[PDB]
């Protein structure tokens, strides 16, 4: 598991946020340094790769390029990001240099009018959930159903459509999974609606649901590899207690300047899984898991 982050260009950081909130450049670089340190200390990411600065502030959103669905690294369409083509090529060069995939799957770049946005895709036990809304029309949903939905026994990979209102952030911002069967959402209309919809879609599975303060950006490295850490914003302390009570490990992270700039912790990193291409029917070495000699 490799995490890719981009250093912020100090000179071109905007003076004021999108709404009008002023920001501090020095505090921004300090918080990015702390974020890089606490991402290195995750004890699950094998290596953290730092990208060179680019003369843009929206290039910090390195997660608007790719979605990892199952075992495929799907590429998001270039519809409103025509100025980020070279940025995407440079990021792909960084991924190639780290031993990742040579290129990406173009299943969405060729479909007509397939306007999709990352973050609307949230992983879940043997499936994904996509958010129907302003940034993701029905053609993306039906293409994803065609490509990934499987309704067979012992091989089911089901994708769920979660309709959301027209003034909601990406589904990955306020909806996520963590630990062994733990769910995290914001305590507002969007979180309750998404939780209820997923309860209807998967009724026979009972799940732990944890409610967080609205506007509290979090990040959990959910996947096949079991983990317990959940990065959470430092300002909110009720959410930290809620996460700790569920049996998970919370890690406070200072993220005020990005919040003033509109960049979430989820959209600032690009987690990827690279598996060594075994040649000749061989198996590589895994990581030391479990306790050795339980019975001595």
């Amino acid at each position: 598991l490799h995490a890719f982050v981009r250093s912020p260009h100090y000179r071109t950081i905007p003076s004021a946020g999108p709404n009008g909130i002023v920001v501090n450049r020095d505090m921004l670089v300090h918080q990015f340094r702390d974020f890089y340190k606490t991402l290195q200390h995750c004890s699950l990411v094998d290596k953290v790769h730092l990208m060179s600065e680019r003369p843009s502030v929206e290039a910090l959103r390195v997660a608007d390029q790719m979605v990892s669905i199952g075992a495929t690294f799907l590429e998001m369409p270039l519809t409103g990001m025509e100025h980020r083509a070279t940025e995407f090529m440079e990021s792909m060069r960084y991924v190639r240099g780290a031993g990742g995939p040579s290129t990406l799957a173009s299943y969405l770049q060729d479909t007509e009018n397939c306007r999709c946005n990352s973050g609307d895709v949230v992983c879940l036990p043997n499936g994904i959930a996509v958010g129907h809304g302003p940034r993701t029309n029905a053609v993306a949903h039906t293409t994803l159903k065609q490509l990934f939905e499987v309704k067979d026994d012992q091989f089911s990979f089901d994708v769920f459509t979660l309709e959301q209102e027209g003034d909601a952030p990406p589904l990955g911002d306020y909806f996520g999974f963590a630990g062994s069967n733990v769910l995290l959402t914001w305590k507002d209309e969007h979180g309750l609606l998404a939780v209820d919809q997923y309860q209807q879609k998967q009724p026979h599975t009972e799940m732990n649901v944890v409610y967080l303060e609205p506007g509290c950006h979090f990040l959990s490295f959910y996947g096949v590899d079991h983990t317990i850490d959940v990065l959470v914003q430092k300002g909110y302390e009720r959410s930290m207690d809620s996460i700790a009570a569920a049996g998970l490990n919370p890690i406070p992270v200072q993220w005020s300047e990005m919040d003033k700039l509109g960049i979430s912790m989820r959209a600032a990193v690009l987690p990827l899984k690279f598996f060594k291409a075994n040649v000749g029917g061989m198996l590589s070495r895994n990581k030391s898991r479990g306790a050795r000699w339980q019975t001595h």
């Binding site: 340094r33 890089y36 790769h49 730092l50």
Partner: protein
């Protein structure tokens, strides 16, 4: 011991490490040389890592470019260029640094182009190793250095490097003569952000590198001086002389640090060797500080041990003593008699410095003068006009008058007559030279000299 080529390269690298940073045991070097003499990779297939390790260990242990193992490794590096990734690039570059064949130059240039192309995708380890390896080859690829400096600055803005990495980076970027004030400022900031994680052993080399690079900013030197003043008590003679040299290189007149350093130096006067004494005297000459009690102590210690004096040490010591004015009687005799024995080790400029220092102090010994004069025929080719003038004046004061020795010096003078006759100083020196040698010894230089140019 019969082993596979990879299993031989691993032990070769271990032997290199033990002989390099764990005492230079001659038996380890002899065993490694014997093992590598019979090693060949003509048939067996190996990774790029194993071949690079074998080449590096062979080159380190004195093997030149004429050996079979070196030729095979260089052939592998030339053919399979795409298998030499960034991980195994610095090893190959460091191995090829000493080699000066055509294949070595081609390999170094190809690795330089590869590193300059991929300079934005490296990490702290790879960047540090690459810049350290390219420091040793003497290459002059400024675009690569700029790319690596930019990557260093961006990677250190997030607090990635540490003490050893900073020391290696500063040494590599100072040896290559890259006066990038922003890069060294970033390195200094990263060092000062490493509170109490930069020990004395990791602080002295940083100061030495920052002094050698020659930074115009004088505010930076103050912080290094204060941190050294805090750390004086935990030092041996090596680091005391090292900071004498470093703060002589800075050129700022500090008072408290110099006093405490002199106190610690006179404390450890029983541990000083020839090189430390020479370095201290040279540093005092460079900074101009006159300290006669310390000079007396250093002169007495240098009198105590004279066999350890190398040609560089001898030259620095005699030049410092002659410039300061203080000079002993028997110490000079011992130094001259010793330099007569090792006259075949002086460099192009060390020989000139030693001869001129002995001539300027009016100390003439026949054995030393004869040895230096006879040796001054293989070094006249590598002499600048000022050094040639100094050597010629030393010979004139020595009264050699030997054509076999004089004609190369006069050939060098004629081949550099513009820089010889237009020196802002030394006019009286040339006048005395020509007074001694007369007009008929060398006509053309006389004709030029009576024309003033």
């Amino acid at each position: 011991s019969h082993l596979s080529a990879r299993n031989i390269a691993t032990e070769a690298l271990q032997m290199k490490k033990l002989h390099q940073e764990r005492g230079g045991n001659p038996m380890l070097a002899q065993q490694a040389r014997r093992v590598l003499f019979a090693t060949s990779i003509a048939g067996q297939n190996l990774d790029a890592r194993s071949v690079a390790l074998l080449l590096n260990t062979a080159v380190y242990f004195g093997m030149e470019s004429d050996a079979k193992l070196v030729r095979e490794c260089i052939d592998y590096c030339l053919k399979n260029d795409k298998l030499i990734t960034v991980d195994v690039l610095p090893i190959v570059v460091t191995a090829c640094a000493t080699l000066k064949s055509r294949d070595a130059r081609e390999v170094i240039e190809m690795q330089a182009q590869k590193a300059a192309r991929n300079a934005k995708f490296l990490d702290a380890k790879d960047v540090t190793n690459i810049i350290s390896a390219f420091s040793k080859t003497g290459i002059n690829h400024e675009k690569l250095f700029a790319f690596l400096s930019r990557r260093v600055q961006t990677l250190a803005r997030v607090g990635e490097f540490e003490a050893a990495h900073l020391v290696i980076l500063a040494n590599a970027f100072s040896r290559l003569r890259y006066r990038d004030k922003f890069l060294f400022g970033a390195i200094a900031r990263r060092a000062m952000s490493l509170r109490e994680r930069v020990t004395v052993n990791e602080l002295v080399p940083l100061i030495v590198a920052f002094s050698k690079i020659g930074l115009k900013d004088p505010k930076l030197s103050k912080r290094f001086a204060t941190k050294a003043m805090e750390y004086v008590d935990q030092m041996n003679a090596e680091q005391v002389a090292s900071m004498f040299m470093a703060f002589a290189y800075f050129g700022i007149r500090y008072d408290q640090l110099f006093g405490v350093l002199t106190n610690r130096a006179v404390e450890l006067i029983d541990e000083f060797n020839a090189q430390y004494i020479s370095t201290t005297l040279n540093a005092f000459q460079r900074i101009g500080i006159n300290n006669p009690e310390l000079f007396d102590n250093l002169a007495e210690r240098a009198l105590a041990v004279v066999q350890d004096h190398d040609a560089r040490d001898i030259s620095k010591t005699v030049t410092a003593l002659a410039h300061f004015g203080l000079k002993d009687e028997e110490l000079f005799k011992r130094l001259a008699s010793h330099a007569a024995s090792i006259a075949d080790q002086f460099d192009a400029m060390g020989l000139v410095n030693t001869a001129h220092a002995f001539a300027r102090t009016n100390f003439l010994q026949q054995d030393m003068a004869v040895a230096l004069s006879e040796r001054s025929v293989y070094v006249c080719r590598l002499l600048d006009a000022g050094e040639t003038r100094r050597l010629l004046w030393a010979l004139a004061k020595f009264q050699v008058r030997d054509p076999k020795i004089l004609t190369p010096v006069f050939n060098r003078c004629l081949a550099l007559h513009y820089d010889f006759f237009a020196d802002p100083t030394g006019s009286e020196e040339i006048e005395e030279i020509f007074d001694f040698y007369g007009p008929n010894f060398c006509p053309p230089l006389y004709q030029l000299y009576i024309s003033r140019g």
